[PDB]
Design goal:
By secondary structure, the protein is α/β, with parallel strands linked by helices. It has one domain: Alpha/Beta hydrolase fold, catalytic domain (Rossmann fold), CATH 3.40.50.1820. The protein contains twelve helices and eight strands. Strands 1-2-4-3-5-6-7-8 form an eight-stranded mixed β-sheet, sandwiched between helices. Helix 2 packs across helix 3 and helix 4 crosses helix 5. The longest helix is centred in the C-terminal third of the chain and has 16 residues. Bound molecules: chloride ion. The site of chloride ion has 4 residues, from helix 8. It is an enzyme of class 3 (hydrolase). Monomer. One of its GO terms (molecular function) is haloalkane dehalogenase activity. Its EC number is 3.8.1.5.
């Protein structure tokens, strides 16, 4: 699995701040927009993009405060990310897109699709955010950890002061061992502890046990939209998974319209690090049939 990042930087200024993004592939079609989550960046897509770039433009932003993007002193609520990504998409002049989304990138992508349904030609998703109505729906191995993350004292100590999301949660949610070169790519944006705010606010925003209410409501709303939308969907899942365990993926296969599921084999949360070639090759071969407007 490749460790390098052979993509030239692009930057766009939106809402006073620079956002970095990958931008490769032809300009004359429907672009494929890749949205990472916590605590990753466009680096997460590095081994997937090469499968898609031959046929389609690939745009992979680093969320505000992450990756090579600027670091405004924000609270980094989901709403901040919504504002910055909305402005990013308009700044690039995107019209119709295909979404390829993960984790908080999936909350962003599904929320954007619900608000802009005529502009979404397909959604490839994996390990995406849905409501967890109670803590029992959250995977047991990660329950005490995330309960601790979602506190103002211990959670800040673990994530900000000890870098637990980068040093702990990230490699623990890849089945294969991440290499030190890969870890250094993930560490780079967060070498200074104070810059870890987004990494702590994100788990505090997850819709778990009814809290925070605003996020629960908006995730319910995009899920209601998704269940009624005819848009083509491609859902990748692994075993045992984290947010989408195998039985959940099978329920979604049946309960989402026009949904193809792809079993990637062993996987926890960061499925892209366990089987990038299957994810990329399956996305690439699924794109052509999305083109036609019927
Ligand atoms: Cl999170």
């Amino acid at each position: 699995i490749g460790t390098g990042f052979p993509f030239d930087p692009h930057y766009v200024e939106v809402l006073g701040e620079r956002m970095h993004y990958v931008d490769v592939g032809p300009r004359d079609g429907t672009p494929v927009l890749f949205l990472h989550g916590n605590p990753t960046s466009s680096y997460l897509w590095r081994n997937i993009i090469p499968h898609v770039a031959p046929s389609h433009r690939c745009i992979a932003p680093d969320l505000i405060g992450m990756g090579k993007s600027d670091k405004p002193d924000l609270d980094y609520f989901f709403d901040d990310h919504v504002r910055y990504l909305d402005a990013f998409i308009e700044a690039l002049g995107l019209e119709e897109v295909v979404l390829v989304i993960h984790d908080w990138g999936s909350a962003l992508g599904f929320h954007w699709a619900k608000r802009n349904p005529e502009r979404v030609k397909g959604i490839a998703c994996m390990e995406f955010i849905r409501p967890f109505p109670t803590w029992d729906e959250w995977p047991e191995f990660a329950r005490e950890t995330f309960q601790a993350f979602r506190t103002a004292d211990v959670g800040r100590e673990l994530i900000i002061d000890q870098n637990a999301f980068i040093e702990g949660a990230l490699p623990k949610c890849v089945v294969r061992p991440l290499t030190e070169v890969e870890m250094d790519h993930y560490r780079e944006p967060f070498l200074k502890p104070v810059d870890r705010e987004p990494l702590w606010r994100f788990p505090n925003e997850l819709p778990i046990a009814g809290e925070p209410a605003n996020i629960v409501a908006l995730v319910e709303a995009y899920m209601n939209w998704l269940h009624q939308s005819p848009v083509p969907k491609l859902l990748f899942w692994g075993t045992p998974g984290v947010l989408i365990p195998p039985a959940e993926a099978a329920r979604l296969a049946e309960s989402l319209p026009n949904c193809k599921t792809v079993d990637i084999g062993p996987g926890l949360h960061y499925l892209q690090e366990d089987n990038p070639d299957l994810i990329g090759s399956e996305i690439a071969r699924w794109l052509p049939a999305l083109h036609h407007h019927h």
